[PDB]
């Protein structure tokens, strides 16, 4: 007889909130838009290296990664990076075009396959 | 705005986080398990994962810190599964371990585990 306790349902948002806080980072993500560095974010190598979707972000702790995105796709970058942590993403008609561009350019094969089927 | 398509691959996360602890690589916390004074067994933690869990409140320390855990000689085999529970957020408890797992949770602020173990003996009050 073995009685199991499971509180693992929270883990999707638990990991998502680690990215939201932007504290204890060991990776710097710069978002260059129209030449100049428009936005900035940070990552946690320990969480990122565990996900095959975040293969583009599999770098040495302390490395600076430069993300070049279209001016149209600037609001969809935060959700895209959070998807590597949370492993959950909500896609609408207006964002399926931009999310497919990001997944193709940054090796998020599962997301790329999902966006392609939504057309 | 009327149609939203959601992708969810978050089911893996219980074991994904559990395997991070299993590997014992890329640690930024040293956990020394002492039994009757002298050091018996050693482990390592990841502050980023541990600080996210309220159960691991005892392990909420600066990256690089050395944490000492003073446990009973009987509760030594339950130490590895107790620390993994902070990562995986899942634990398998038996009749022989429910006594030890309640001692660990009470002494190291794992309130959810302490509450679960206490409710279990109302069921295990009998032999089998």
UniProtKB/TrEMBL annotation, chain B:
Subcellular location: Secreted, Extracellular space, Extracellular matrix
Disulfide bridges in this chain: 27-44, 75-100
Function: Promotes integrin-mediated cell adhesion. May stimulate host defense against viruses and tumor cells.
Protein name: Galectin-3-binding protein
């Amino acid at each position: 007889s073995t009685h199991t306790l499971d509180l693992s349902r929270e883990l999707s948002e638990v990991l998502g909130q680690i990215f939201d806080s932007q504290q204890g980072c060991d990776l710097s993500i710069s978002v260059s838009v129209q030449g100049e560095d428009a936005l900035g974010f940070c990552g946690h190598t320990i969480i990122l290296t565990a996900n095959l979707e975040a293969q583009a972000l599999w770098k040495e702790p302390g490395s600076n990664v430069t993300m070049s995105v279209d001016a149209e796709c600037v609001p969809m970058v935060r959700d895209f990076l959070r998807y590597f942590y949370s492993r959950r993403i909500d896609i609408a008609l207006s964002s399926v075009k931009c999310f497919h561009k990001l997944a193709s350019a940054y090796g998020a094969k599962q997301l790329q396959g999902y966006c392609a089927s939504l057309f």
